[PDB]
Amino acid sequence: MHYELSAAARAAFLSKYRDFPHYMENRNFTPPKDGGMWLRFNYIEGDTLYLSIDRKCKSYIAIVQIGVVFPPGSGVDEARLKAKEIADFFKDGKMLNVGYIFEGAIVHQIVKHESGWMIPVRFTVRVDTKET
């Protein structure tokens, strides 16, 4: 099972940030007219581990990426504050309705572009399953 992980992640993210403009996978999205900051949802798939010798208990590991984008020349502190809000919400050990957060709230160095800056935050979800 791998669809349920994405479904649960989308449910949590979308319930927390309904109103805030955001971009989903493979949907034609236009940015806000004023150029205000918007959310970028992304999903990265990791490997699957066969734990036992009978090949019956398995593990699924997935990487979830949230990127915040902001116009150049408008400063960076408010973007950092928003990213901190996201990370604090996505705290360690949270019990997802299908899997659970293996470890969350990691912020990486800013990527700089001449048209608009972006800050990536990244976490990982994990599901352990037993096959019968």
Binding site: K56, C57, F102
Partner: protein, 219 residues
């Protein structure tokens, strides 16, 4: 020439009443005389509890043919008669149920290194040795820890009793099936470490010898 992936583990949980056999002949496929048919049927494993034949005791066998008076057991060869003198009495029970341990991470074992007796003679100069007995064999299993699982009480009571118990291992790729019986030991100390699964330990001693039978023939 096969990969052991996909093997399964089962443990004995309950046995029926003791059944006494009066005599058994010696050939490739032994057959024994029983007073009563009882509840025996096709494809049930049996544990041997005591018999005159020292090599035969403490073994798990499988029934081949069942009648009112004759029970055929396969898995052990009695072609030789000097090691298996005639007129030996037999006594065994029947295993009723089985229980499978949750998914097993690693399987470990030790022993089997045959020791040698080295002697030097003054007449010659080269030194030669003689093979000797074999070391004891112990089997160690590892599997995930779970509190709500029921077999914990069974394992604790088996450890407390110390009674011999049968173990079944089923390998699909080679279509094999291994029988042995021994003493159980259960460890209930979870191995807590950062960012990997915590497991418990199960150990099985050995009282007899490994037997290899066809899974299709057994069932």
């Amino acid at each position: 020439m096969h990969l052991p992936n996909g093997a399964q583990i089962f443990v004995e949980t309950s046995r029926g009443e003791e059944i006494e056999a009066t005599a058994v002949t010696n050939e490739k496929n032994p057959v024994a005389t029983v007073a009563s048919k009882g509840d025996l049927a096709k494809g049930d494993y049996v544990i041997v509890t005591q018999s005159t034949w020292a090599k035969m005791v403490s073994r798990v066998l499988i029934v081949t043919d069942a009648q009112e008076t004759s029970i055929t057991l396969a898995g052990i060869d009695t072609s030789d008669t000097l090691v298996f003198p005639a007129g030996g009495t037999m006594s065994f029970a029947k295993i009723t149920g089985w229980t499978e341990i949750p998914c097993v991470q690693e399987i470990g074992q030790d022993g089997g290194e045959q020791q040698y007796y080295t002697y030097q003679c003054l007449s010659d100069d080269k030194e030669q040795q003689i093979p000797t007995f074999k070391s004891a064999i112990s089997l160690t299993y590892t599997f995930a820890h779970e509190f709500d699982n029921p077999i914990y009480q069974i394992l604790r009571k088996l450890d407390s009793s110390g009674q011999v118990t049968a173990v079944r291992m089923y390998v699909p790729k080679a279509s094999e099936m291994r029988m042995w019986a021994g003493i159980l030991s259960f460890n209930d100390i979870p191995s807590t470490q950062v960012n990997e699964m915590e497991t418990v330990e199960l150990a099985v001693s050995l009282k007899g010898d490994f037997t290899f039978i066809s899974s299709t023939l057994a069932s």
